[PDB]
Amino acid sequence: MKTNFKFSNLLGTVYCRGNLLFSPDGTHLFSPVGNRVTVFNLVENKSYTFPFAHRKNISRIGLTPQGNLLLSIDEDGQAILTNVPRRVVLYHFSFKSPVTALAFSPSGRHFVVGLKRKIEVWHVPSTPDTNEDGDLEFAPFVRHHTHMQHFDDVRHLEWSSDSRFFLSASKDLTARIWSLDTEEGFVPTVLSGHRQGVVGAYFSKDQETIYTVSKDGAVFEWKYVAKPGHEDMQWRIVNKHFFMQNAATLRCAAYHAESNLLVAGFSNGIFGLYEMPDFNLIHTLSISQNEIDFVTINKSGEWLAFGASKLGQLLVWEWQSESYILKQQGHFDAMNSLVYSPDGQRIVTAADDGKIKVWDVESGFCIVTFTEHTSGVTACEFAKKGSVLFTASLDGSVRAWDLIRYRNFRTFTAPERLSFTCMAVDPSGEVIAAGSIDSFDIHIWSVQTGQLLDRLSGHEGPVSSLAFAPDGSVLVSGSWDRTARIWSIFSRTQTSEPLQLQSDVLDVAFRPDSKQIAISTLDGQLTFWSVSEAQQVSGVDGRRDVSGGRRITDRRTAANVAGTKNFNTIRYSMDGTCLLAGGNSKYICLYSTTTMVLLKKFTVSVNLSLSGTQEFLNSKLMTEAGPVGLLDDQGEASDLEDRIDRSLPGSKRGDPGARKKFPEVRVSGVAFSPTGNSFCAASTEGLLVYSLDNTVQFDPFDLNMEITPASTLAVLEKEKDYLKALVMAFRLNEAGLITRVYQAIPYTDIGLVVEQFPTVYVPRLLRFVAAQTEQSPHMEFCLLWIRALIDKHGPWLAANRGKVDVELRVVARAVAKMRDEIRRLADENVYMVDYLLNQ
Amino acid sequence: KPKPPAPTLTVVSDVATVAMEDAQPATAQGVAGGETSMIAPQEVYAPSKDTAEKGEVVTKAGIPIAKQEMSREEKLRRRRREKERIRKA
Amino acid sequence: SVQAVQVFGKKKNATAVARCVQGKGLIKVNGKPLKLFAPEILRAKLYEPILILGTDKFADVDIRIRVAGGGHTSQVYAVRQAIAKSIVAYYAKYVDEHSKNLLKQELIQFDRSLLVADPRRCEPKK
Amino acid sequence: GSAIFAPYRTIGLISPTGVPFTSIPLGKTTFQITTSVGRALQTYDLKRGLNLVFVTRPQTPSDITATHAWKERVYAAFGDPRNGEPQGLWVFQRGKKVAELPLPSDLDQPIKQILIFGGWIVACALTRIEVWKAATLEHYTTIFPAASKKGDNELTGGAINMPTFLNKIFVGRKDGWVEIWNVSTGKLIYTLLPPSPDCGAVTCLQPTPALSLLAIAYSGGPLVIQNVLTDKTVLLLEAGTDDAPVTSISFRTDGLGAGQDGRKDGVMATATSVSGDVTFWDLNKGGRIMGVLRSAHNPPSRHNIVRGGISKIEFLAGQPVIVTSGLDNSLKTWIFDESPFSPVPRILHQRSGHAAPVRCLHFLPSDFDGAEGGNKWLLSGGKDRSLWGWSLRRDGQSAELSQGAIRKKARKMGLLAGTTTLEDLKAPEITCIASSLNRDGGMGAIPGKQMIWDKNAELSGNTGWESVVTAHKDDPYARTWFWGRRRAGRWAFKTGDGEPVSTVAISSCGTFALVGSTGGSIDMFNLQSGRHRQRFPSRFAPGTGRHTNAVTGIVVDPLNRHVVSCSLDGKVKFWDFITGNLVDEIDWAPMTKIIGCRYHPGNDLIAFACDDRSIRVVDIETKNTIREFWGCRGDINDFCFSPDGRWIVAASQDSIIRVWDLPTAHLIDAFRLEQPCTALAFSHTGEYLAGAMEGSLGVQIWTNRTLFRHVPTRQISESMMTLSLVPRSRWQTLLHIDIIKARNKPKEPPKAPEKAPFFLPPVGQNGISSLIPQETFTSKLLVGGAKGDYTDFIEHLKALPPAAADLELRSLSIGNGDEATNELLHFIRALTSRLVARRDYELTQAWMTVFLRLHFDLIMENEELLQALGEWREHQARERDRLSELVGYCGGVVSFLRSPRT
Amino acid sequence: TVQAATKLIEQGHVRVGVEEVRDPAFLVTRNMEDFVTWTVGSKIKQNIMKYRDKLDDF
């Protein structure tokens, strides 16, 4: 296969620290996930991720009111603005201070930004998307004004409706009113009188009343009325009223001015929304146990979006219907393992939070969170059938869920109490093997019986990796006795052939055509063994290829750090030609299993807020008291629940205290996609899905000189030789041209074209018609294509079965979509109509 | 060492699996998925002796047969099979 | 300052130390040459790593082996393991890792027991 | 212009021109140093290193010939109108043009210097001074000096102000006269004559820190310092040779630094334009010399290609540092030490660039997916024998890959005083470079200090060896370079043939460096141990495939399977890697003579540039040429691929750059340059193309406009049951909208108050949601039933939210009892029309499912629409028999073929 | 001594099980006291093997 992997969407986390945004249409939700920004399309269930990546976590998101330009601010103020229709990175520009407020003007020409005390209003740069004859300038941002008439952190900035004034809400307890240019009857007045600093100052619709919401839970109205001695008027205060959330301080409020309603989210997680100018409590409820960090409102006004930072906890709330639109949760611990579903539409990941959840690859949302484990969940696995999921965990139980009814029909335990750390399951789905670190025996239960079949034994150490062979005949265990075992269980003799290695076994993986196995040791080397004649046929010494390190709290050079020089997990391709290998390090290696070379190396994260993402830390961050990202700075926090350190001394694997400042980078699980053309990896930032880039890269198959798109359309339209045109298009390998000729040939000549089509281009054609069935609205046409293809090349595919397994799998799931989506409805409709017609 | 296993029971309803799904704008299942009622037909109704009629018995097959229509030979054989189960226990 | 690599080799109870240094091309076992130390038919077991790897790899090194224990067969297998592992470890430390990987690939493609000693444990059919 | 590449910035260029810099003190801690690109200005900060603060936009239409830096604004005068070019004077602030000056109409002269003081800005052109008033930026008058001879009118030197002198400029003439001019009333007020009138032309003049003392520097050699109101000479110094006239002078306003102890004031630095050494004078006793800082920049030679000279000296205000800027693309600042007495200073800041045009360019390969990307590091080999690593992100983190202690060697030789030169102390000029950072070890590549170019491997394997291999001009060795350490590598590989190197390449894995001589021999070296591994051919018939002519363009497959090596005379040979034998040749021998090749990994395509002015693109797997391009009217100077593979860009010697679409096999754009391009390099992601021109020192970065805005350019030049498009999510939750809202309700209800607000304020567009598209669905359906076509009602119902669709499907009714007034019969007939037309099968079935689900009672009790249900059942039964047989056949046969052995 | 042990596990020679441990406060339970040992490429491990004269350089 072609190993040209770009970065497709991030997944597995839905929100991290930062600002939330809606589209001006109201459908897309822009949320920051570490150092990237996902877009969740909510009208059609979709999601994507912008191709940029900041060096630190996102601080702010802003969006131009036309909709097109997004401006994302990292920590330390590095800004990237990008075009949202054509998802491309446009400008990089560094505000030199940490941005703590940001707001674009509703006219669209300006944007104001609050760096800690400063307030800079900038022009919005002219872009190649908007000008006809235009290009990228060098320094596109032109500063308009700077205001340092201020004394503490600028916590909020809100423009007017006519975009001539704006309000800056502060941490020095005073909101101020500023102008864009010098107006006639205006002085830049201050609005003093609070108790704990303003959260937000907002205008009204007709800009007379301006409201200020402060941190203690009080919202005050401000009007331009005369002083009580009566030209002479003053911005003074007409009434004040208080949210009576008892033992909490409000963290974020928003105000929809067209519909006049104010929402406020508090420290105890219970938000409340109020029809403001008379202050009637519309309602209030508790969305989160921890707190609420960022609230935004729809432009229409009918949706609210809340984000809690300590967990994932992103949720949109439709308030008049009183129901969630989405309530999504990312993992707040280390993602221990993951597996794709055998269809390939959804992946399921298991973290040390205790929960497992099933994410959908499109639309990026978790669809079910199984929460029966009472401790951290280790390896999860599927069967061949794909309906049953088996999950092991440290609470001692291998549970067994059925995904058509969503309930664990089995739970398995060992009689003496163990804590399972690895597991495998027979592809028939009838035998589960699992192994732990406490005892060195390896347990086997039956799924259809429920009781313990056996304790296999012969290991002189804890068994680290288990793998059942995909045909179903051989278990392979790998353990810290520097050994692996070919267990043959299902035969009448139960036998064990040892493979003696050089160090502790860390990972075991099979080839799909089961004759080969790759086992990854603790030296950092991969050894490719054969399973029939148990001899090592191949080997890679891969320490240097994965060694990228130097965490904080690491007094070795990144070249001398041992521990990030091994492969904790390895997976073959669905082709079987390329391993993918990932350990406790920044790099993912993609090896070839025949030619034994590293085809491509990837970097999981650019994010410098994680700990081990650059192998040469700079000496600017080393003070005389250790590094600068190591001093405990909890005491400089305004909130007590942020100041309290409920951490346990020496707890590597999770504690609920979980200081978690600068977490390490480690790839704890990798998996290829069963439909091919993608893999994904569970990092600490999220769940990165890499995929092949075929539409942005010219790559012909075996091309001649007289074969152009013009010549292909010429022999299509003039000559009308459909087989020649289709073979020329598949030879050029341009998907638009292939789609054009594929739709252009007629449905009676499909059979002639397929009968005279070549068998070297048969699997590419099968993959193309599978994609066209799953995407295009030409369903009967693509099904006639599939029918003619399998009826003509029937014995060839059944004779091969290994060279074409992924093509048959994607054709099978395309017709599974068409079998479950339309024909159940057609049959149910015709039976209901027959009954109602028969009275 | 984790904990001794203590029995915990979970009450599932007869709602569809899209009531166990998480909150999102639309389901991830198709149109065929979403009618699976989260408890099997064996839990909706299972024919047994505790839910049989007065005159009838239910067999191991789940079929109501009455004691009046049952012959003497089948009565003797059913008595022998129940006595065989009692001897096994 | 000197380039020197000490590698062990193992069989039932026959053990072999092989010290490989920068030299002119000699191989000595117990102070006597490699063409002398064996039974007359097992010298083809001794010359196996040299004939796999070619003589150009052994042109630069000087290997000195001591053996103790075992019988004639176990000592011959220990000598050939010490030879193969010794030249692979020298090419690991003092020339390129690509040459180390090429030597390891050729030796593993011939016989894995030239590099990894597999002991015979007792586990019959339980 | 072009249709693809838009100009961005000339990078690698800090001070290439004769225009001197200008320094302005910011506050008490910073100095802004503003130099001239040639079409823009760069302002650097001095406290922050010399990192670039501002560069000036837009690019001025002619070359900038004068500059000055007032309070914030930078004034820049451009254009010599004596040869064609338009002229002007522009006021920039923060790198953007904020004002323009109105030049007079009868100004046909270049404009030599600008001088701002009082409220007046004053421009000395050549024989003429134009003076504006600065508070209003308006023209005031024009000073015309007069002469009797033609030559003596020329205003060389310039004009300067004395500090406490009200409204007076001091101009120097081509004759020895310094004329004082009152610029308010435009009146010549005094003239002061040269002493010993053999010294002819005033070369410069500078005010001392003493009051009313001016330092005039004549072309005959003397520096005088004179009271300009007493007209009496304070000091006279023979400061220059008659061939080397003193050109720039500057005084130390610190208050110390002279008198052989360092605690006495009165130091003056001076420089001539023909030398590269500055000279320091202690003015105390008679004005003795105290030190000469030798070779502060390159000394200019009329015979050599390397530029040189010193454009300006400036002591900063009240500080020991001296900022000097030379013509050899370099800006240095030196500092006098305090506690030991240093008569000559020591260097503290320096930025530099190429002192010659750039010969070759190479964007560095991408750090695998890291923050570098493909588009940060450019690698430029210049004609001044230096290899620079430019950074497009920040212009201060670019630094020369050092070849050793070259300046220490040139000072321990006699190369700084006055034999060869400092450029000749380096490796020869770089022909080509090839690099791969798969084994670049960063800063700690090989710890400790290593030898350079020599002509221990456990530590090399742990950390990392060399990254760049470099073929030089006429040397038999192909040198190697550490990239991450920014220094020269420890190896230098001879060809084997003894002839000079012609091409060089590196393997994709970063291990093997392949050199190819100009005699034919191709050798492969291991870069970790630096050892000769494989020779091509080793020693078709095995052993004989050797080239007969030079070897230009070898490149290795990324799988380490084949190396494809291209001869000058004729043929292209694919060799096996591990064997070293010839596998397959292709011979274009009697008609072409190939001058280069480029390779695209991830595409398996090779592009050869031949001597018939053509580019032949060959697939390396099928070994036949697939695309030939005939566009050039000169020799191809440099050509490159696109990272998509979709274009190939070629810059020929005719100074036209041509872009070819490779799938369409066509031209796209061909833009004409002002100077022929010498080197091209595209970045490893798609934004930047970089061209090194001929004559210009420092490369030109073009952006890629197609990544941002779509360009429609393809101009060949010379000079059946279908589904709908409706989202699956939308109709699949229309079919299921009861349980989806039941799961979307929260577990606990919201705590609404007892006094609940009745009549909540209206959200959404006019009381309803904002997703319903604005302009009576029953009116739509009934007028569509009055007409024949229901397409309006169907295209209205398609674009609805699912809640509103369930609402408009629940709100149908029988009504009056006629066939033309009921909505149920017309809805059934509309779905029947869609089943006949075969348009939206999935939506028709979903709509009918929920329709029968919530209207079965009326359609069971009524008989006026059971005929419509019968017709719907006829069409539905036909279509579902056909489609169910189809999808069941494909599903069952595919499930059989996936596993046929049970 | 405990001082030398804290120095060695700050320099990072000690793994517990399969993961290297840089924190000198990691509480070793009774069944992980059977799995604390040196790291992979340890100079301390080479020192022990060089003392015992079993320094295998492979």
Side-chain angles (χ1 to χ4, degrees), chain A residues 265-274 276-277 279-282:
Chain A
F266 291 85
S267 154
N268 47 2
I270 166 168
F271 87 101
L273 72 102
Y274 306 82
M276 181 39 61
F279 197 65
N280 284 308
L281 194 145
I282 290 180

Side-chain angles (χ1 to χ4, degrees), chain A residues 408-425 427-429 431-437 439-440 442-453 455-457:
Chain A
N408 46 348
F409 66 100
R410 289 296 148 90
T411 166
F412 304 99
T413 42
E416 72 275 15
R417 300 170 293 152
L418 271 70
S419 86
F420 304 120
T421 68
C422 66
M423 62 92 61
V425 53
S428 299
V431 159
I432 297 174
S436 160
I437 207 177
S439 74
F440 316 133
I442 162 174
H443 292 259
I444 284 177
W445 309 270
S446 196
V447 177
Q448 65 180 357
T449 295
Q451 283 180 350
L452 191 142
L453 253 50
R455 298 173 183 82
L456 309 192
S457 45

Side-chain angles (χ1 to χ4, degrees), chain D residues 574-575 577-583 586 588-593:
Chain D
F574 316 125
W575 316 85
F577 196 93
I578 198 63
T579 313
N581 281 342
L582 188 41
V583 162
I586 53 170
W588 307 321
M591 63 280 289
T592 77
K593 182 181 63 184

Side-chain angles (χ1 to χ4, degrees), chain A residues 668-684 686-692 694:
Chain A
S668 281
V670 290
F672 266 96
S673 179
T675 80
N677 293 164
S678 310
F679 67 94
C680 75
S683 158
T684 59
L687 180 36
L688 313 158
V689 184
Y690 292 88
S691 77
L692 268 74
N694 297 116

Side-chain angles (χ1 to χ4, degrees), chain D residues 375-394 396-422 425-428 430-439 441-453 455-457 459-473 476-496 498 500-522 524-556 558-568 570-575 577-583 586 588-603 605-610 612-618 620 622-634 636-637 639-653 655-660 662-668 670-673 675-706:
Chain D
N375 52 344
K376 177 183 173 190
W377 292 108
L378 190 135
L379 210 42
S380 82
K383 202 175 286 290
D384 66 322
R385 304 194 167 189
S386 47
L387 175 77
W388 275 80
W390 300 112
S391 176
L392 318 183
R393 282 178 209 260
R394 195 163 82 235
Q397 55 181 0
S398 53
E400 178 181 0
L401 277 75
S402 88
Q403 321 189 5
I406 304 166
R407 199 156 169 101
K408 191 183 76 198
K409 268 187 66 166
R411 203 201 32 101
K412 291 217 152 191
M413 296 172 186
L415 259 66
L416 258 48
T419 183
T420 50
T421 188
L422 194 140
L425 215 57
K426 290 187 249 210
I430 289 183
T431 289
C432 85
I433 43 185
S435 66
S436 176
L437 50 87
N438 192 23
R439 295 291 190 232
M443 292 185 301
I446 315 287
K449 63 182 293 293
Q450 278 85 48
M451 62 192 317
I452 282 155
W453 295 338
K455 300 186 177 178
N456 180 45
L459 184 132
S460 298
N462 288 352
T463 68
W465 56 82
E466 272 91 25
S467 320
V468 191
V469 204
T470 297
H472 289 253
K473 178 182 259 312
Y477 305 104
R479 279 88 154 98
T480 196
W481 307 77
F482 289 122
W483 162 250
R485 300 180 75 175
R486 276 93 190 172
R487 76 180 267 142
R490 42 183 183 147
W491 308 128
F493 309 121
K494 199 153 199 179
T495 43
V501 290
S502 176
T503 195
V504 77
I506 200 172
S507 168
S508 176
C509 70
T511 305
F512 294 110
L514 281 87
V515 312
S517 67
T518 196
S521 86
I522 294 155
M524 158 180 313
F525 297 86
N526 200 316
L527 277 162
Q528 175 181 358
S529 53
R531 279 183 206 200
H532 182 92
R533 282 312 158 195
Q534 188 58 57
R535 185 178 42 238
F536 295 94
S538 49
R539 68 162 78 105
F540 280 2
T544 175
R546 192 202 173 89
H547 290 119
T548 74
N549 209 5
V551 185
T552 66
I554 62 188
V555 77
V556 187
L559 206 60
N560 291 339
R561 285 308 207 183
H562 300 277
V563 303
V564 40
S565 81
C566 163
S567 172
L568 193 68
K571 41 195 86 75
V572 168
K573 292 181 177 180
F574 316 125
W575 316 85
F577 196 93
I578 198 63
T579 313
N581 281 342
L582 188 41
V583 162
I586 53 170
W588 307 321
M591 63 280 289
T592 77
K593 182 181 63 184
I594 307 170
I595 81 176
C597 89
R598 298 299 187 272
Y599 177 70
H600 201 282
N603 204 2
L605 281 183
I606 309 166
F608 291 98
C610 322
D612 47 18
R613 311 176 165 88
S614 82
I615 292 180
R616 321 181 154 273
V617 178
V618 56
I620 183 176
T622 73
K623 303 179 169 54
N624 56 335
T625 174
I626 76 164
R627 289 297 144 94
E628 64 189 25
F629 294 126
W630 294 89
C632 284
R633 293 192 184 89
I636 293 97
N637 260 328
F639 76 110
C640 79
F641 267 102
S642 200
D644 324 305
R646 287 187 179 267
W647 310 329
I648 166 162
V649 190
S652 57
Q653 198 174 1
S655 60
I656 292 101
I657 286 188
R658 303 175 156 83
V659 189
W660 282 290
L662 189 65
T664 326
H666 280 328
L667 262 162
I668 301 182
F671 58 95
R672 158 81 55 89
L673 302 169
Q675 277 274 355
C677 180
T678 50
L680 281 194
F682 209 93
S683 67
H684 278 54
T685 176
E687 325 100 336
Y688 299 126
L689 189 139
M693 308 296 205
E694 211 184 301
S696 160
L697 65 168
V699 310
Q700 176 70 252
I701 294 279
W702 290 287
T703 45
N704 199 352
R705 223 180 283 172
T706 75

Side-chain angles (χ1 to χ4, degrees), chain D residues 287-313 315-327:
Chain D
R288 80 172 166 92
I289 193 176
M290 61 156 42
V292 170
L293 171 81
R294 297 209 176 273
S295 190
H297 301 264
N298 297 133
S301 276
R302 281 99 178 109
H303 63 270
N304 213 339
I305 188 64
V306 171
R307 311 190 181 195
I310 282 176
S311 44
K312 212 199 170 190
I313 283 186
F315 282 108
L316 296 187
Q319 275 152 52
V321 286
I322 165 172
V323 189
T324 171
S325 176
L327 297 178

Side-chain angles (χ1 to χ4, degrees), chain A residues 493 498 500-502 525 529 536-539 596, chain C residues 100-101 104-105 108 112 116-117 119 121 125-126:
Chain A
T493 180
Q500 167 76 32
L501 300 199
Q502 289 171 18
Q525 58 172 349
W529 292 71
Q536 170 182 2
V537 305
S538 292
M596 309 302 297
Chain C
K100 167 197 85 81
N101 291 332
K104 246 182 184 162
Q105 185 71 274
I108 284 172
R112 181 174 164 81
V116 174
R121 305 166 178 100
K125 281 158 87 85
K126 301 176 210 173

Side-chain angles (χ1 to χ4, degrees), chain A residues 86 138-139 259 281 284 300 320 324 544 595 601 616 696-698 703-705 707 709 801 826 829, chain D residues 8-9 96 368 441 444 463 561 602-603 626-627 644 663 709-710 744 751 753 757 761 763-764 841 845 849:
Chain A
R86 176 156 318 172
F138 178 78
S259 67
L281 194 145
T284 181
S300 174
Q320 41 187 4
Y324 296 127
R544 181 56 188 84
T595 49
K601 203 195 302 193
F616 286 109
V696 289
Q697 175 137 8
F698 176 66
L703 201 53
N704 262 279
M705 204 163 77
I707 301 180
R801 278 178 290 188
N829 282 345
Chain D
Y8 189 68
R9 187 164 74 110
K96 295 292 176 295
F368 310 105
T463 68
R561 285 308 207 183
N603 204 2
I626 76 164
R627 289 297 144 94
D644 324 305
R709 42 184 308 272
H710 73 290
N744 281 359
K751 304 184 61 57
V763 287
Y841 190 55
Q845 295 318 301
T849 289

